Design a protein around this ligand. Structure first.
Ligand SMILES: [Ca+2]
Length: 78
DNA sequence: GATCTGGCCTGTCTTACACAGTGCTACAGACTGGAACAAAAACCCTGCAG
């Protein structure tokens, strides 16, 4: 399987689709491969009704808050 | 010692006050796949405009 292998064999196996995404992203988005594979990951996770992992991902990619503002904290407290 | 009466009893009537909050669970409410749609957003592109 692809998930247990090292990065050498993973990239060796996937280089075809890696350069496919490379050329398609330089075609459409103008030098943005990272956001292209991000939108691909989001669509592949939402098609399977696993919205939770997509929400965690979006909370990692410039996520609003690791920690909370003291205000809403006091709110929850009371 | 009757008489009448101020006042007291009792019965009834009216407005008030604690009865949350806690686990279970079912339901409706939200999310998607192809087809296909219309309706606007904003540049570009042209005209009819002086
Ligand atoms: Ca009351």
């Amino acid at each position: 399987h692809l998930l247990s292998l090292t990065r050498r064999a993973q990239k060796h196996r996937l280089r075809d689709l890696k350069n496919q995404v490379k050329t398609f992203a330089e075609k459409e988005e103008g030098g943005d491969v990272k956001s292209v594979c991000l939108t691909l990951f989001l669509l592949a996770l939402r098609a399977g009704n696993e919205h939770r992992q997509a929400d965690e991902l979006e909370a990692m990619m410039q996520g609003r808050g690791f920690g909370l503002h003291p205000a809403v904290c006091l709110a929850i407290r009371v």
